[PDB]
Every structure is written in C-alpha cells, then in structure tokens.
Amino acid sequence: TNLRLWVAFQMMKGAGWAGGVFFGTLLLIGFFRVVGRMLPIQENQAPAPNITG
Amino acid sequence: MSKFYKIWMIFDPRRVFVAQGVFLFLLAVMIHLILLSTPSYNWLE
Amino acid sequence: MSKFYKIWMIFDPRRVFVAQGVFLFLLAVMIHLILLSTPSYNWLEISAAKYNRV
Amino acid sequence: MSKFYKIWMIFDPRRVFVAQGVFLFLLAVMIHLILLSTPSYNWLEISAAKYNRV
Amino acid sequence: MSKFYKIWMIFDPRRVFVAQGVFLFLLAVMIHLILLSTPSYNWLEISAAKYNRV
Amino acid sequence: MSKFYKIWMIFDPRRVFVAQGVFLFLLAVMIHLILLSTPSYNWLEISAAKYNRV
Amino acid sequence: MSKFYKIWMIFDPRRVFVAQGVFLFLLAVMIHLILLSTPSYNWLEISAAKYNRV
Amino acid sequence: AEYQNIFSQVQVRGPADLGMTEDVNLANRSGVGPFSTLLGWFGNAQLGPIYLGSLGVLSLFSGLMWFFTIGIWFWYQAGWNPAVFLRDLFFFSLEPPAPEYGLSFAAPLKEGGLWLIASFFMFVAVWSWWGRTYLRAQALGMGKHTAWAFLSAIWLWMVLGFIRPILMGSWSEAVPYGIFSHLDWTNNFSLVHGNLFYNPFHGLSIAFLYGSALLFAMHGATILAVSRFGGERELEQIADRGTAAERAALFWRWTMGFNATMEGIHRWAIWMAVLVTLTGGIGILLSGTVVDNWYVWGQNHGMAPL
Amino acid sequence: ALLSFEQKYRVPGGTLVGGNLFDFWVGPFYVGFFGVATFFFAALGIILIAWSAVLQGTWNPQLISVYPPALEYGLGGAPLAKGGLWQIITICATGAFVSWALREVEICRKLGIGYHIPFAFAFAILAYLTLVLFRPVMMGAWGYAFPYGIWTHLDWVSNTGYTYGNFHYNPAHMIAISFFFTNALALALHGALVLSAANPEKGKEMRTPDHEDTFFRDLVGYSIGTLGIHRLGLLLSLSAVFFSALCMIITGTIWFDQWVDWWQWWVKLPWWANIPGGING
Amino acid sequence: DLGYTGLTDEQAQELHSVYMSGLWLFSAVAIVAHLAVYIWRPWF
Amino acid sequence: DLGYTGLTDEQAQELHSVYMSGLWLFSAVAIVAHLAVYIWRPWF
Amino acid sequence: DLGYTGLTDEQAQELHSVYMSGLWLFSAVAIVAHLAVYIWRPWF
Amino acid sequence: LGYTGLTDEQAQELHSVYMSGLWLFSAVAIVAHLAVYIWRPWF
Amino acid sequence: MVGVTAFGNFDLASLAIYSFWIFLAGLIYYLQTENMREGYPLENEDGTPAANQGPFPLPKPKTFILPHGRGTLTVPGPESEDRPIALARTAVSEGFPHAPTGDPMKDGVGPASWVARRDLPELDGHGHNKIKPMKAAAGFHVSAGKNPIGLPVRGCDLEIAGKVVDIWVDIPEQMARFLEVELKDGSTRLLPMQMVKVQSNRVHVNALSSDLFAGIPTIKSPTEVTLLEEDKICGYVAGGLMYAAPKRKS
Ligand code: BCL
Ligand SMILES: CC[C@H]1c2cc3[nH]c4c(c3C)C(=O)[C@H](C(=O)OC)c4c3nc(cc4[nH]c(cc(n2)[C@@H]1C)c(C(C)=O)c4C)[C@@H](C)[C@@H]3CCC(=O)OC/C=C(\C)CCC[C@H](C)CCC[C@H](C)CCCC(C)C
Ligand SMILES: CC[C@H]1c2cc3[nH]c4c(c3C)C(=O)[C@H](C(=O)OC)c4c3nc(cc4[nH]c(cc(n2)[C@@H]1C)c(C(C)=O)c4C)[C@@H](C)[C@@H]3CCC(=O)OC/C=C(\C)CCC[C@H](C)CCC[C@H](C)CCCC(C)C
Ligand SMILES: CC(C)=CCC/C(C)=C/C=C/C(C)=C/C=C/C(C)=C/C=C/C=C(C)/C=C/C=C(\C)CC/C=C(\C)CCC=C(C)C
Ligand SMILES: CC(C)=CCC/C(C)=C/C=C/C(C)=C/C=C/C(C)=C/C=C\C=C(C)\C=C\C=C(/C)CC/C=C(\C)CCC=C(C)C
Ligand SMILES: CC(C)=CCC\C(C)=C/C=C\C(C)=C\C=C\C(C)=C\C=C\C=C(C)\C=C\C=C(/C)CC/C=C(\C)CCC=C(C)C
Ligand SMILES: CCCCCCCCCCCCO[C@@H]1O[C@H](CO)[C@@H](O[C@H]2O[C@H](CO)[C@@H](O)[C@H](O)[C@H]2O)[C@H](O)[C@H]1O
Ligand SMILES: CCCCCCCCCCCCO[C@@H]1O[C@H](CO)[C@@H](O[C@H]2O[C@H](CO)[C@@H](O)[C@H](O)[C@H]2O)[C@H](O)[C@H]1O
Ligand SMILES: CCCCCCCCCCCCO[C@@H]1O[C@H](CO)[C@@H](O[C@H]2O[C@H](CO)[C@@H](O)[C@H](O)[C@H]2O)[C@H](O)[C@H]1O
Ligand SMILES: CCCCCCCCCCCC[N+](C)(C)[O-]
Ligand SMILES: [Fe+3]
C-alpha cells in the first residue's frame, strides 16, 4: 500500500511535470493566436512564401 | 522472465518511475494529436 | 555463440540497456510513421475509405 | 590472416564495437531507403499495385 | 621496395588504419553512387527494364 | 642529383608524405572527373553508345 | 652570378621551398585550365573533333 | 538575485593609466581624457590617451575631407535648407558617374566627379588607418594580427568600390555614399545578378557571419561563466592554466565532444571573423565578371531544381 | 579518453532530472536525461528528413526540402507527405534544441560555472521558434514558416522579404544588421588583440593586458577591457538575435505594406512636411 | 546478487510485484478504452 | 580475466540469460504482430 | 604481448574468436535474406 | 628508432598482417570486377 | 569571362569554391591541432595514456617567454597534476562519475577543484602586483555604485558571517576583484566580486553558508594574493554552490 502510493506518486510527478510543460506551451501558443486574431491580419493576409500552396 | 525483477537492481527505481511517467504522458499526447489530425477520428469536430 | 555473454564483460549493462531501449523505441516510431506516410498502409485512411467515413 | 586477431591489440574493443554497430545500422538504413526510393523495389508500392490497393 | 614495412616506424598504426578504412569506404561509396547516377550502369533500373517492372 | 636525399634533413618526412599523398589523391580525382565530364572520354557513356545500352 | 648561393644565408630554405612549390603548382594549374578554357587549345576537344568521337 | 557579471556592482577609480612605453614615441601620445562612469558600468571608464602620428594625421585629414565632401554635397542637395537637410538626411546620396563615362575621370562634378574626389579621400583615409594599425602594434612589440584582420575587411571594401568597378569597366558599378542609397545599391546588385542567395560565396559569407555571432556569444558566455575563477584574464590563463580554463574546456568537451584552449579559441575567433569579408570579396568579384545570373548557375550546379 | 586534467572534475551530481540514472559519459560526451532526449529527437528528425527525401524523389542534399503545410490547412495537421512530416520534424527540432539547452544547464551545474551559455542559446531557440511557431501561429497558418532545405529556406527568405518590397527598410532589421556587423568586427578585433599579445614579434616576451589596453588606446583612444570585451560580445550577439526576432514578429502581423513607405512618417512631419527642395520636396 | 542501486534481491522482487500489478491494471484500463473506441468506430 | 566492467563470468552469464529471455519475448510478440498484419494486408 | 590496448595475446585471440563467430552469424543471416530477395525479384 | 616507438620486428610483423589484409581485399575486388566486366564490360 | 568553362560546368566560380573547400579543410585541421596544446595526450581514468588519441596528431611544441623573468612555457609538454585527488571511481567501467572520499570542498575536487598555479602574484606590465588592496593602492577610491566596505556579509543560510573591511582592486584594469571579509574570530577571507551580490544594506553570498566562511583558504601575506591562492579561494567558493546545497534558504 505504501509502496503502491510511492510508485504512483513518482510516476505522477514525472507525468505532471511533462503535462505542465505541455500545457504551458499550449497556453503561450494560444496567447499568440489570440493576439493574432485581434489584429487586422485576415484583412491583410500575406501570400504564401513557398512553392507549395 | 522470472528474473526480470533484477531490473530494479541495476536502475534506480525512483528515477525510472519518473522517466516512465514522462514517457507515458508524451506518448499519449503524441497519439492523441495524431488522431486529432485525422478527419475520421477528430472527436472535437 | 556460446560465448556471446562476454559482451557483458566489455560493455556496462546500464549504458547498453539505455541505448537499446532508445534504439528500439526510435525504430518502432520510425517504422510506424513511415507506414502512416504511405497511403497503401495508413490504417486510419484505410478504415476511413472502407467504412465510408471520408 | 591467422594474425588478424592482433587488431584488438591496437584498437579498443569498446570503440570498435560501438563504431561498427553505428556503421552497420546506418548502412542498412541507407540501403533500405535507397530501395524504397526506387519504384521497382519499393515493396509497399509493389504490394499496393499487386493487390489493387490504390 | 622490400623496406616498405618501415612505414610503420614513421606513422602511427592506429591513425593510419582509421584513415585507411574511412578513405576506402568513402571511395567505394563515391564509385557506387557514380554508377547509380549513370543510366547505363544503374543496376536497379537495368533490372527494372529487363524484367518489365514498370 | 645524387644529393636529393638531403630533402629529408630539411623537411619533416611525416608532413611531406602526408602532403604528397593528399595532393596526389586530389590530382587523380580531379583528372578522373575532368575525363568523366568530357563526352569523348567518359568511358561509361562510350561503352553505353558502343553496346547500345541507353 | 657565382655568389647566388648566399641567398640561402638570407632566407629560410624550408619557407622558400614551400612558397616556390605552392606558386609553381598554382601557376601550372592556372595555365592548364586557361588552355582548356580556350577552344583552340583544349586538347580533349581537338582530339574529339580530329577522330570524330562525338 | 544572482550576480551574472554583466554590469559592475562597484566602480573603483584610481590614477589614469598612461600606457606602456615600449618603443612608442611618447611625444605623439596625447593626454588622458575624462573618466566615463556610464562606460565604466560596462567596461573601462578611462578615455584616452590616443596616439597621433604621421599616419594618424594623414588618416584624420583624409577621412575628415571625405566626410566634408559628402556632407557639403548633401547640403547642396538640400538647397542649403537645414530643415530639408534633417528631413531628407537618409535620402541624400553622392552617386558614382553614369555608365556612359566608363572608368574615365571626365564626369562632371554633379554627375560623378565629386564622388571620385570623395572616393580618393576615403581610399587615402582607409589605407592610412591600415598602416596605422600595423605600426601601432609594431611599436609595442605585438604581433600584426590586427593589421591582417583589417586587411580582410579592406579586401571586401576594395572589391566593392575599386576592383570590381575596374574589372566591370565603369565607375557606375560602385557603391553610392548614402544611407538608403547604398541599401538600394545592395538590393539592385542582388536583383541584377539573378539571386545573390545562389552565390556560393555569399552563402559562405553568411555562414561565417552567423558563425561569428555564434562563436562570440559562446565565447562571451563562457568567459562570463568562468569569470568567477578569473577567466577574463586570458593571457595569464595561457601562461599559467587555471581552473577557469579547465572548466571552460570541459564544458564544451562534455557538450559537443571537443574543446579549445584559452589561446586557440581566439584563433577560431579571428578566422571566423575574417572569413566573412574574405569570402564576401570573392563572391562580389565573381558577380558580373564570371556569373551574371546566380540562380541559373545554381540550377546548373545542383543547387536549384531544373 | 580524458583530458589530462579531466579526472578530478567528473563527479556525481548537478543533474536536474534523472539523478544517477543517466549520470555518465559516452566518450567525451556527458549523457543525462536531456542527453538521451536530445539523441532521440535528433535521430528521429534526421531519419524523417531522409524519409521526406525518399518521398520527394531526390537524393541530392542540396535539393532535399521538407515543406510546411499549405496555407489551406491553417494551423491544423497536414498529411505526412504534404506538411505532416514538417510538423513532426519541427517538434523533433524543438525538443532537441530545448534538451540541448537543459543538458548544458546540467553540465554547468556539475562544473560549478555560470549559466550564461544555456541562456545565450535560449535566444537562438527563441528566434527559431519565432520563425516556425510564433509568427505562423499569429498569422494563422503553418505555411508561413520556412521549409527545411539548404537552398529552399533561402527561397523562403527571399519571398518573405520581397512581400514587403525591399526588406532593408524594416527598422528593427536595420538595428539587427548593425548589431551583427558590429559583432563580427568586435570578434575580429578581440581575436587579433589576444593573439598579438600572446604571439609577439619573434624572440620577444609575452605581452600583458597592459599592452592590449595601450594598443587600442593608441589606436582609437578607448579600451573596453578584458571583461568588457566579453560582456560586449555576449550583448552584441544577443541583441542582434533579439532584434531579428522582433523585426520578424512585427512583419505581417502589424505591418502589411512596403517597409520603404514606413519612413514617410519622418518625412511627413508637420513642420518640414511641405518645405520645397531636397529629395522629398 | 549483482547490485548497482542498493536494493537487495527481496526488495527488487517486492517492488517488481507492485510494479507489475500496476502495469496490468493500467493495461486493462487501456484495453477497455480501446474496446470502447473500437465498438464506437472500428479502425480495421 | 578481462574485466572491462567488473562483472564476473557467472554474473555475465546470468545477465545474458535474463537479457536473452527479454529479447525472445519481445521477438515473439513482434512475430505474432507481423503474422497478424500479414494476414490482414500482405506486403509480398 | 605488446600493444596499445593492454590486451595480451590470448585475450585478443579469445575476443577475436567470439567477434568472428558473431560476424559469421550476421553474414549467414544476410546471405539467407539476400537469397530470398533474389528469388523474389532478381536485380541482375 | 623511428617516430612511433615500434621496433623493427614489430613493424615487420604489423606490415605482414596489413599486407595479408590488403591482398585479401584486392583478391575480392578483382573477382568482383571480373564478374561485373563479364556482366557489362565498360570498354 | 561569363560562361567560360574548362570542362563540364567548371568555370572560375567552381574553381574558387573547390579551392575554398580545400583551404577550409586545411584551416580546420590547423585550428583543431592548435587547440591540442593543453590536455593532450588523452589518458584513462587511472592516468595511463589512452589507446585512442583521436584523428589529429599533437602539434609541434611552441614556446612562450614569460614577461617578467617568470621563465618559459613549452606547450604541449609534460603535464603537472600530481597533487592527490580524493576521488574513488564508482564503477569499474569507464565513463562513470568518481565520488569524493571525504569533504570535496577541503580536498578541492569536483566543482570545488583548483589547479596548481604558480605561487607568485600576477604582475602588471611594469612588474608590480596586479591585484592590491584598495587602501594599499595609492589614489584608488570607489567612484560609483554602493560602497560594500562596512556592510555585513550574509551567507546562503541567511546568517551573517562577517563584515566587509576592504576591496582588493585590480590596478591596471581598475576593477574590483575581491572583497575582504572579517569573520567572527577576527581573521579575514577573500571573496570574488563575481560570487557576491552587493545590496543596499548587506552583501549576500549565495554559494557559501555562514559556517563555511572560516574554511575559505587563507592567503600568506596580508597585502598580496598569489595565483595559487586565488585559484584555491575561487574553487572553494564555487564548489560551495553544489556542496553547500543542503544548507540553503534557512
Ligand atoms: C536583396 C539584398 C541581398 C543581398 C545582397 C548583398 C550584397 C550586394 C553584398 C552582400 C554581402 C553580405 N550579405 Mg547579403 N544580401 C542579401 C541577403 C543577406 C542575408 C539574409 C538573411 O537575407 C544575410 C544575413 C546577408 C549577409 C551578408 C553578409 C554575410 C555580407 C556582408 C559582410 C559584411 O560584414 O560587410 C560589411 C563590411 C564591409 C562592407 C567592409 C568594411 C571595411 C571598410 C574598410 C570600412 C571602413 C569604414 C569607413 C572608413 C567609415 C569610417 C567611419 C568612422 C570610423 C565612424 N545577406 C540579399 C539576397 N549582400 C556582401 C558580401 O561581401 O557578400 C558576397 C556584399 O557585397
Ligand atoms: C573581418 C571583417 C570585419 C571587420 C574587421 C575590422 N574592421 C576594422 C578592423 C578590423 C579587424 C580594424 O583594425 C579597424 C579599427 O580601427 O578597428 C577599431 C577597423 C575599422 N572598421 C571600421 C568600420 C567598419 N567595419 C565594418 C565591417 C567589418 N570590419 C567586418 C564585419 C563596417 C561595416 C559593416 O560597414 C564598418 C563601418 C572602422 C571603425 C575602422 C577603420 C576606420 C578608418 O579607417 O577610419 C578612417 C576615417 C575615416 C574615413 C572617417 C573619419 C571621419 C571623421 C569625422 C574625421 C575627422 C575627425 C576630426 C578631425 C576629429 C576632431 C576632434 C576635435 C575637434 C576634438
Ligand atoms: C543567439 C546568438 C547566436 C547563437 C548562440 C548559440 N548557439 C548555440 C549556443 C549558443 C550560445 C550553444 O550553446 C549551442 C552549442 O552547443 O553550440 C555548439 C548552439 C548551437 N547553435 C547551433 C547552430 C546554429 N546557431 C545559429 C545562430 C545563433 N546561435 C545566434 C546567431 C545558427 C544559424 C544562424 O543558422 C545555427 C545553424 C548548433 C551548432 C548548436 C546547437 C546544437 C543542437 O541543437 O544540438 C541538438 C540538435 C541536433 C543535433 C540537430 C537536430 C536536427 C533536427 C532534429 C532536424 C533538422 C531540423 C532543422 C531545423 C533543419 C534545417 C533545414 C535547413 C534550414 C538547413
Ligand atoms: C627507411 C625509413 C626510415 C622509412 C621508410 C618510409 C616508407 C616505408 C615510405 C613509403 C614509401 C612509399 C610507398 C612511397 C611512395 C611515393 C610516391 C607514390 C611518390 C609519388 C610522386 C609523384 C609526384 C611527385 C607527382 C607530381 C605531379 C605533378 C606535380 C603534377 C602536376 C600537374 C598539373 C599542374 C597539371 C594540371 C592539369 C589540368 C588542370 C588538366
Ligand atoms: C553637418 C555637416 C557639416 C556634415 C554632415 C556629414 C554627413 C551628413 C555625412 C554622411 C556620410 C554618409 C551618409 C556616408 C555613407 C557611406 C556609405 C554607406 C558607404 C558605403 C560604401 C562605400 C565603399 C565601398 C567605397 C569604396 C571605395 C574604394 C574602395 C575606393 C575608391 C577609390 C577611388 C575611386 C579613387 C579614384 C581617384 C583617383 C584614382 C585619383
Ligand atoms: C488493484 C491492484 C490489483 C493493484 C494496484 C495498482 C496500483 C493502483 C498501483 C501500483 C503501482 C503503479 C502506479 C504501477 C504502475 C505501472 C505502470 C503504469 C506501467 C506502465 C507501463 C507501460 C508501458 C511499458 C508502455 C509501453 C508502450 C510502448 C513501448 C509503446 C510504443 C508505441 C509505438 C512505438 C508506436 C506508436 C504509434 C504511432 C507513431 C502511430
Ligand atoms: C507530446 C507530443 C510530442 C512530443 C514528443 C513526445 C513523443 C513521444 C515520446 C517520445 C520521447 C522518447 O521516448 C523515450 O525516449 C527515450 C529516449 O529519449 C527512450 O527511453 C528509454 O528506453 C528504454 C526502455 O527500457 C530505457 O531502458 C532506457 O534507459 C531509456 O532511454 C525511449 O526511446 C523512450 O522510452
Ligand atoms: C588551393 C587549390 C587550388 C586548385 C583547386 C583545384 C580544384 C579542382 C576541383 C575539381 C573538381 C571537379 O568536380 C566536378 O566538376 C565537374 C565540372 O563539370 C562537375 O560537373 C559535372 O556534373 C554536373 C552535375 O551532373 C554536370 O551538370 C556537369 O555537366 C558535369 O561536368 C562535377 O559535378 C564535379 O564533381
Ligand atoms: C554607449 C553604449 C556603451 C556600451 C554600454 C555602456 C553601459 C551603458 C549603461 C548600462 C546600464 C548601467 O546602468 C547602471 O547599472 C548599474 C548596475 O545595474 C546600476 O547600479 C545600481 O544597482 C546595482 C545593482 O543593484 C548596485 O550594486 C549599485 O550600487 C547601484 O548603483 C546603476 O544605478 C545604473 O545607472
Ligand atoms: C490512468 C490515468 C492516468 C492519468 C495521467 C494524467 C497525466 C497528466 C497528469 C497531470 C495533468 C495536469 N497538468 C496540467 C499538470 O498537466
Ligand atoms: Fe577572449
């Protein structure tokens, strides 16, 4: 019982650290997306810089 | 096969469990993203 | 062949196990992604076309 | 030819084994990718055309 | 001509052997890739044309 | 002329030998590539035309 | 004209020899490439035209 | 928080250092200027003394006349109106002669002659300064690494202004003296010769500029990281290696598998920096004289799709 | 393996993650949690680039290009043949770069030195993420990022720059170019000065920092110092990269026109807007 | 009795028993979720 | 006798036994997976 | 004997024997694979 | 003497083994070249 | 000269690029060999020479003449690391950490390492001591920033370990190198400026706790510090960052 909780706590520590980094990255990306949507970018959409569409 | 427990006599269990949790979360997120990119399995649409 | 165990008298088990696990996971991910790239073996696309979900 | 074993009195077994493993894996990967890049030996494409999967 | 062995009294055997092997592999790769780049000696394309794998 | 051996009391034998080897290899590679670039001396192309391969 | 040898009590023989060799090789390569760039002195092209190779 | 050794916490001031004598003519060395606290927060506070010799006088007068010629042309271009001078300061330009004059010196003053006069002034100023960088190192018994590193930048400068215009047969190929106009010249140079991205030596110059930023960020960070062991005293670490040099070497050995010495890192530095303009001069010299379209050249050389 | 002074420095500790699980060396390299992560990410990225070359149909290294998704895909996933491989390779590259920085942090902790090197590397990582993550996300499409090709990412640079006329007129671009040029000049001067002090005219004694200070005081009238030059180098490089990231993050998000037209604000200032003469009168 | 980490044979056996119990429980949960998704929308 | 790692002959033999058991189990699972996939979609 | 790796003659002989056995095993597997491929689709 | 510390006898023995390897490699290359020439002569 | 080729597509641009590739190979070889003047030849973890020495040979030795009758240095040459190192290998295999067999700060191993430098002061270009106490330095004074003299010094355990009594300035560079800190027992220690944080009312030393200040190596002469003493002091203080960790934020 003590050993089961210890193993679960170690695994949850690793998983929670990875998840914190992942959702922090998503939060920053969402911040950039929100800032880009309140900007006149859709009216001023740039051409594609690559030969692919 | 009945001697696999000796893996805990070579690698420190405390660090192995943390690394395993990191692996499991990252793998789950990767698979979920791959499914999310497919139109036939995008549960958010 | 009866003396391959001597690989453990030259290479430390810790580094060898770490490297082998890295290599195994990397190879498996690479093969799965290569199969996903090909339309003929992308199982998600095959299921979508088989069940008319796309 | 009987004295080739003296390569191990000049080169460390650990470095030689690691370098040989890396070389063999990279050579095999290169050859497999070269075959996949040729349409006449891309076995996935050959199977797709053989069983009408495209 | 019979005294070429003295090359090992001047140059380091380990570094010479490593340079020898690297040079030999790079030369062989260059020749194989040059042959592959020429249509008349690309053995994969030659076999594809011979066996009508197009 | 019978005194050229004194070149070895002026220049390091190791550096001279390595420089000569590198220079000779680069010169040979350059000449072979020049020949391959000329249609009248590219032996692969000449044989292809001779045996009606392309 | 009979006292030119004293140039070796002014300049280092090693540096002089290295500089002279580098200059001579660069000059020879320059002249050969210039002659190849000239269609009236490109000997490979001259022989190709003479023997109707291409 | 933690002191990162980027700005000094405490400034200490003493008597001004008058420098080493060696074989320097001390009569040509001026007095020490004031002390700058603002500069002392980052480096040394002391300004001066400067050395002014024969080549120094020649370089200062030549460069002053170069600036004066450009500035008086700008003032004429403004109609002697100070407000117009400030409005259009970045839009003024002293342009080379028109292409119909070739390399001749018959172009009028407003159509190329004044540019030739300013270019002569700049030529004299820059070569005098190179001689000055050589002789100042000679006076102190130092090696001439600064002079030959300056020659690498002089090579690109000569190609841009002197050598390539002569090889191309006109002074119009040269760079105008202006802020926005030399940017326009750069853009038009790239456009006229295809794509300068597809110049291999432009790519090498960019690689070495990027590598200069790379290497000197790495070196500054490394020296600041081991400055707690006196790592910024690099000459004493060359003479008597301490734990700062060892730790700096071991960080990079453990990171990327190889390291440098406290001396050889500065050889890496000098070569990475000089190769920028060394490859740039060759890349510019091959444009128009050997290759007129760099994109087609790259297509024929396996760099772009056919 | 070892340098002659290496043995006393190889001690346990200084690891952020993993403890002693990965605390060892492979040859000269130090492996850790982030070393193993770096290896996995780099190997996957390089192998996927090779597979993208297989799909593309070329083996010429200078013709291989991994292209981002088309603009039609927006910020969503794309098929691996079109832009999905690019997205996976970008994730692998980001993982490799961040794990490299964290491995450097671990090595710094083990050696007892400052964290200036990982901090300076974070600036390059941030510029890369600006080019592949922040700017494309702000603009709304993964297709605004650059492809992974030796000469096609130069095509991306050219196309993105010429979308706004001559890109020289971006002001933060001007500042970043000034910083890059000044950094190269300072690197040349610093290498030359240290080498000239350590390698005098033949037969002479080593020169001191006093001679270096004297030489640049004689030359330009000012010497920044041994600490000042390394601080200056760090700041010049980091400022150049910061202003590059800024000029690209403002481009196509708050500025959508020709950058040459931006400078008309100074010309059209009310007091000298209408004075005849000069260039703009 | 080869140890790099200080655990005895008994400690390794007990910890591996706990680990394998957790692994089988986690795999059973994954199997149940996979079967639910396959019932919802098969991928073969 | 050539102890690059400090393992004895018997320790190396036992470690190889366990490693080979793990390898054979992994390979057997892979063989079953390959056989199932080949029945589903042969690549030859 | 005398060398750079501090390996005696007998140690080098034993190590080479086991290395050559591994090399021959790898080569036999490669030969069988090549024979299978050549029967399936010869490249000559 | 020399530069590498190898004895005359050591250099001779090392050269013997190196030349055995060289001759084996050359024989294999000669057989390969003969097979290719019979398949597709390049002259 | 546009389009003029010797053979194939080989023009002056191709000739220049291949010439530069040859030159760059040579230059990189030279640069890598120039950086093998310290730490080579490579050796095993027991100090014996390593079988693998890499692909680059050692450069031919060079000689520095030292400025002030300090001798002559030849590199690469015989190595000088003969002081005992209190480390025991934690594994028979190569590439594993060596653990301290005592107190690493006192034994000078790990991040607390120091190098056996010359037991002589560093001199400026005029033959005088480069680093001097500010009161011993003639005309030197604090010109900007907070004067740390008189401020109490706080360790990483949030406890006072002494007070600043002097600044050791570098006379040629005109920068502060060390802070002299008086301890409880009335003796003084030198602390590098790069390892201290001068605040409004205190000087904070995050590397060392209050009880590790007495263990800082002491200098022989009260008005003179040698390269060896400097190296020992700096190594001790920086090894405090790792070996004084259990005594943080208290
Ligand atoms: C559309 C614009 C064009 C372009 C056309 C040009 C042209 C034209 C040239 C470059 C060149 C360069 N380009 Mg380009 N370039 C393009 C895009 C780029 C991009 C990019 C990401 O897009 C990058 C990073 C670069 C970067 C560079 C540098 C690598 C290189 C400049 C080296 C240098 O430091 O000169 C700065 C240093 C000097 C000019 C020498 C200075 C030395 C002299 C002696 C200074 C004297 C000072 C004087 C006396 C004043 C004194 C004042 C007082 C002291 C205060 N290019 C494109 C495609 N580029 C140059 C090169 O050489 O490459 C082949 C060059 O000629
Ligand atoms: C390796 C290539 C890089 C490089 C290297 C480099 N540059 C160098 C050097 C080196 C190694 C030097 O040694 C040299 C130097 O002195 O550096 C400090 C220099 C130098 N590189 C310089 C500039 C420079 N380098 C550049 C680039 C680069 N330099 C490359 C990136 C650039 C760019 C990118 O455009 C510039 C602008 C200078 C700072 C200096 C050479 C200075 C020189 O020659 O000056 C001549 C003077 C003039 C033509 C103008 C004088 C104008 C004044 C108004 C004159 C009148 C003054 C007046 C009389 C004062 C009166 C005062 C009293 C009234 C009180
Ligand atoms: C911010 C200031 C400057 C800077 C600093 C800097 N760079 C650094 C550091 C620092 C302080 C390091 O510590 C770190 C280092 O260790 O250097 C040796 C590094 C480094 N900077 C590097 C490169 C680099 N820096 C650049 C720029 C700069 N670096 C800035 C100008 C550039 C440019 C301008 O192009 C490059 C190419 C490496 C040598 C190294 C980091 C090595 C690394 O990340 O290792 C782990 C990853 C791999 C081994 C490779 C992963 C490959 C991917 C999985 C696939 C390929 C992806 C890629 C995007 C494809 C590109 C295709 C085309 C665009 C060509
Ligand atoms: C006894 C003791 C103590 C030690 C013994 C050490 C031992 C054993 C040594 C090993 C002995 C061996 C193998 C030696 C081998 C030597 C060899 C192959 C020498 C070869 C020399 C060849 C030379 C110059 C060739 C020079 C050629 C030149 C310029 C050509 C120049 C051409 C130009 C410039 C034309 C260019 C043309 C175009 C561009 C189209
Ligand atoms: C207020 C007052 C009083 C004054 C204000 C002064 C002001 C405003 C000044 C503004 C100055 C400005 C903008 C300058 C901008 C300059 C720029 C960008 C230059 C860029 C590149 C220049 C280059 C490559 C020049 C290279 C020239 C070279 C190799 C040599 C030329 C030599 C020649 C042609 C000699 C010719 C003559 C003879 C042979 C006799
Ligand atoms: C009630 C009872 C009976 C017991 C109580 C149990 C409890 C509560 C706690 C016990 C302690 C705990 C926490 C133990 C937890 C153990 C756990 C999670 C073990 C988990 C192991 C997971 C493993 C190996 C997963 C490996 C997965 C792999 C390679 C997947 C690889 C996939 C690849 C390479 C292909 C990916 C596909 C594509 C790219 C398209
Ligand atoms: C989350 C979205 C995508 C972000 C990236 C995440 C992708 C999915 C996870 C990939 C991370 C790597 O996945 C993990 O990699 C490390 C190397 O890094 C390796 O991890 C481990 O493998 C074996 C398994 O016993 C261990 O013994 C070994 O010590 C260890 O290295 C394996 O390869 C894999 O366990
Ligand atoms: C400091 C040393 C100074 C002297 C330097 C001398 C360097 C000499 C290097 C010669 C190398 C020649 O290298 C070879 O050149 C020819 C010239 O057409 C190139 O060109 C060849 O291939 C391309 C691509 O298929 C063809 O379009 C072209 O028609 C063909 O000739 C080769 O791709 C290149 O491999
Ligand atoms: C022309 C540019 C030349 C290159 C750059 C030259 C330096 C330019 C100035 C950089 C900023 C310096 O600005 C200066 O910073 C220092 C250190 O933070 C401050 O110093 C202040 O804070 C520090 C740290 O808390 C205290 O130890 C100090 O006693 C106090 O005075 C000064 O109050 C501030 O004026
Ligand atoms: C069997 C279910 C296991 C659930 C594992 C969940 C992993 C992530 C746990 C932490 C998630 C929260 N956060 C934001 C910190 O990531
Ligand atoms: Fe430096």
Coordinates of N, CA and C and ligand atoms in Angstrom, one line a residue, chain F residues 30 33 37, chain G residues 26, chain H residues 300, chain N residues 7-10 15 18-19 22, ligand 8:
Chain F
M30 N 40.6 14.9 -59.5 CA 40.3 16.0 -60.4 C 40.4 15.5 -61.9
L33 N 37.5 13.1 -62.9 CA 36.3 13.9 -63.0 C 36.3 14.7 -64.3
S37 N 33.6 14.4 -67.4 CA 32.9 15.5 -67.9 C 33.0 15.7 -69.4
Chain G
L26 N 50.3 26.3 -58.5 CA 49.2 27.2 -58.8 C 49.3 27.8 -60.2
Chain H
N300 N 22.4 24.9 -62.7 CA 23.4 24.1 -63.4 C 24.4 23.4 -62.5
Chain N
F7 N 35.8 22.6 -68.4 CA 35.2 21.3 -68.7 C 33.9 21.3 -68.0
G8 N 32.9 20.6 -68.6 CA 31.6 20.5 -68.0 C 31.0 21.8 -67.7
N9 N 30.7 22.1 -66.4 CA 30.2 23.4 -66.0 C 31.3 24.1 -65.1
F10 N 32.5 23.7 -65.2 CA 33.6 24.2 -64.3 C 34.1 25.5 -64.9
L15 N 35.9 26.7 -59.7 CA 37.3 26.6 -59.3 C 37.5 27.3 -57.9
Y18 N 35.8 25.1 -55.1 CA 36.6 23.9 -54.7 C 37.9 24.3 -54.0
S19 N 38.5 25.4 -54.5 CA 39.7 25.8 -53.8 C 39.5 26.2 -52.4
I22 N 39.1 23.1 -50.2 CA 40.4 22.6 -49.8 C 41.1 23.5 -48.8
Ligands
LIG8 C1 44.2 25.6 -53.5 C2 44.0 24.6 -54.6 C3 43.8 25.3 -56.0 C4 43.3 24.4 -57.1 C5 41.9 23.8 -56.8 C6 41.5 22.9 -57.9 C7 40.2 22.2 -57.5 C8 39.7 21.2 -58.6 C9 38.5 20.5 -58.2 C10 37.9 19.8 -59.4 C11 36.6 19.1 -59.0 C12 35.7 18.7 -60.2 O1 34.4 18.4 -59.8 C13 33.5 18.1 -60.8 O2 33.5 19.2 -61.7 C14 32.5 18.9 -62.8 C15 32.7 20.0 -63.8 O3 31.7 19.9 -64.8 C16 31.1 18.9 -62.2 O4 30.2 18.9 -63.3 C17 29.6 17.7 -63.7 O5 28.4 17.3 -63.0 C18 27.3 18.2 -63.2 C19 26.1 17.6 -62.5 O6 25.7 16.4 -63.1 C20 27.0 18.3 -64.7 O7 25.9 19.2 -64.9 C21 28.2 18.8 -65.4 O8 28.0 18.9 -66.8 C22 29.4 17.8 -65.2 O9 30.6 18.2 -65.8 C23 31.0 17.7 -61.3 O10 29.7 17.7 -60.6 C24 32.1 17.9 -60.2 O11 32.1 16.7 -59.4

